[PDB]
Amino acid sequence: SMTEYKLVVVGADGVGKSALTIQLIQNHFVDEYDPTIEDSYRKQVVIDGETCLLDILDTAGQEEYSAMRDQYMRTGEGFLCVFAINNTKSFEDIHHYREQIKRVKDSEDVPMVLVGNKCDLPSRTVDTKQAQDLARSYGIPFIETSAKTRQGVDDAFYTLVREIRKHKEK
Amino acid sequence: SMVNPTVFFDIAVDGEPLGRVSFELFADKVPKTAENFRALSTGEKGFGYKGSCFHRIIPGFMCQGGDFTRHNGTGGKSIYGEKFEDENFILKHTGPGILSMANAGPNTNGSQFFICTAKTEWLDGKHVVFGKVKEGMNIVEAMERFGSRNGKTSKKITIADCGQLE
Ligand SMILES: CCn1c(-c2cccnc2[C@H](C)OC)c2c3cc(ccc31)-c1cc(O)cc(c1)C[C@H](NC(=O)[C@H](C1CCCC1)N1CC[C@]3(CCN(C(=O)[C@@H](C)N)C3)C1=O)C(=O)N1CCC[C@H](N1)C(=O)OCC(C)(C)C2
Ligand SMILES: Nc1nc2c(ncn2[C@@H]2O[C@H](COP(=O)(O)OP(=O)(O)NP(=O)(O)O)[C@@H](O)[C@H]2O)c(=O)[nH]1
Numbered sequence: 001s002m003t004e005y006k007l008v009v010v011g012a013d014g015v016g017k018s019a020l021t022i023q024l025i026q027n028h029f030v031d032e033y034d035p036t037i038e039d040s041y042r043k044q045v046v047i048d049g050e051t052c053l054l055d056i057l058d059t060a061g062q063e064e065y066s067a068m069r070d071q072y073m074r075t076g077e078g079f080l081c082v083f084a085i086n087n088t089k090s091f092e093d094i095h096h097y098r099e100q101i102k103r104v105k106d107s108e109d110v111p112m113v114l115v116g117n118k119c120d121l122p123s124r125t126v127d128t129k130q131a132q133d134l135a136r137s138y139g140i141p142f143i144e145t146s147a148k149t150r151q152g153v154d155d156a157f158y159t160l161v162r163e164i165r166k167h168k169e170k
Numbered sequence: 171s172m173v174n175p176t177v178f179f180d181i182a183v184d185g186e187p188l189g190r191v192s193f194e195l196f197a198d199k200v201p202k203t204a205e206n207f208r209a210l211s212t213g214e215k216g217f218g219y220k221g222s223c224f225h226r227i228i229p230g231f232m233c234q235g236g237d238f239t240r241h242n243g244t245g246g247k248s249i250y251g252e253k254f255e256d257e258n259f260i261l262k263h264t265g266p267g268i269l270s271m272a273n274a275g276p277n278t279n280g281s282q283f284f285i286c287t288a289k290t291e292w293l294d295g296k297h298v299v300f301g302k303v304k305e306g307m308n309i310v311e312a313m314e315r316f317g318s319r320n321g322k323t324s325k326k327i328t329i330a331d332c333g334q335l336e
């Protein structure tokens with residue numbers, strides 16, 4: 001048999017949500033910035049021996065359309081909360097996403113993974129320990145990724161599936 | 171108009187002529203922003219809209235264009251420098267044909283702009299309205315049909331020619 005998971009990629013504009021998604025789906029790094037409105041992708045994978053159909057909703061990094069945002073969060077089962085390690089504001093935004101997801105889904109326990117992207121770049125402004133401490137305070141995984149080198153890309157998405165499965169067990 | 175300049179775009183679809191859209195630019199109420207668009211339409215500063223693309227067209231909302239620096243929806247520049255401040259919010263996004271500046275947040279006007287195809291009142295106070303379609307709203311409606319929900323166009327919509335009338 002198989003099981004389907006609705007994954008939603010959220011985070012400030014430019015952090016690499018689409019580049020991460022395109023690496024997962026198409027196995028190449030988009031060097032250019034093509035700003036997202038909204039895109040959906042699907043991919044069948046095996047995670048921990050169990051066949052999964054992944055639905056990936058790649059959202060735009062914007063804060064203007066709250067009715068759409070709320071619906072994204074209602075439908076999504078797990079959230080990849082992405083910041084860029086060279087963008088402190090994007091890291092400071094993270095707690096807002098968690099607060100919104102918990103409110104929309106009426107739960108203190110929503111599957112999510114904190115993703116620190118662009119770890120190939122030499123211009124870091126957010127320390128790994130800062131992000132690890134925030135993730136630990138939420139009880140969620142933290143993964144450093146580079147959509148450019150593909151480091152951590154599969155791990156970020158697969159860990160999110162693992163988090164959804166752990167939540168469904170409760 | 172006795173006061174406001176009129177500019178035109180000749181729109182192309184995959185290089186083929188679609189038709190002409192003309193705009194009244196509200197220099198009477200939004201002079202700095204109107205003047206930027208006028209001068210980018212004539213090219214008189216040595217750069218401007220001729221050849222650029224309407225890269226994002228979302229039916230029911232707007233046709234957005236004007237990135238002649240990066241040619242990918244991320245760029246553009248004004249006649250005052252890369253960016254200029256939000257001049258005023260006197261005018262609102264009251265319906266189809268409204269011409270308004272695209273931006274990346276407060277005080278980031280460059281050259282990108284959008285033509286509303288519906289009322290977009292949630293943009294009031296966040297984007298500077300500075301003009302309106304005068305003639306050729308049917309051409310804008312034809313352009314809108316090449317758009318899609320995510321903004322990607324099914325054929326490439328460009329400003330084949332542009333300039334000032336009257
Ligand atoms: C929730 C679904 N979604 C719905 C929706 C809602 C309700 C129902 N249905 C939908 C859709 C039909 O469901 C699918 C709308 C919408 C709009 C965006 C994203 C998702 C949306 C959006 C995405 C963008 O990438 C940019 C913008 C909006 C604003 C846009 N700016 C830019 O393009 C500028 C350039 C212009 C000059 C400067 C560079 N850039 C490009 C790169 C960035 C992104 C953010 N950057 C930042 O630096 C941030 C961190 N400070 C850099 C940027 O700012 C702009 O001025 N305009 C003009 C007005 C219209 C607007 N575009 C647009 O397209 O509205 C589409 C629409 C449909 C009206 C709203
Ligand atoms: N060096 C490096 N660049 C990256 C990485 N991920 C994304 N980028 C670059 O950062 C820019 C923005 O990436 P993108 O994935 O489009 O960001 P987004 O979060 O989807 N933006 P939006 O919210 O507007 O849709 C692009 O130029 C892209 O190539 C990464 O891991 N390393």
Ligand SMILES: [Cl-]
Binds near residue numbers: 064
């Ligand atoms: Cl917007």
Ligand SMILES: [Mg+2]
Binds near residue numbers: 018035
């Ligand atoms: Mg994106």
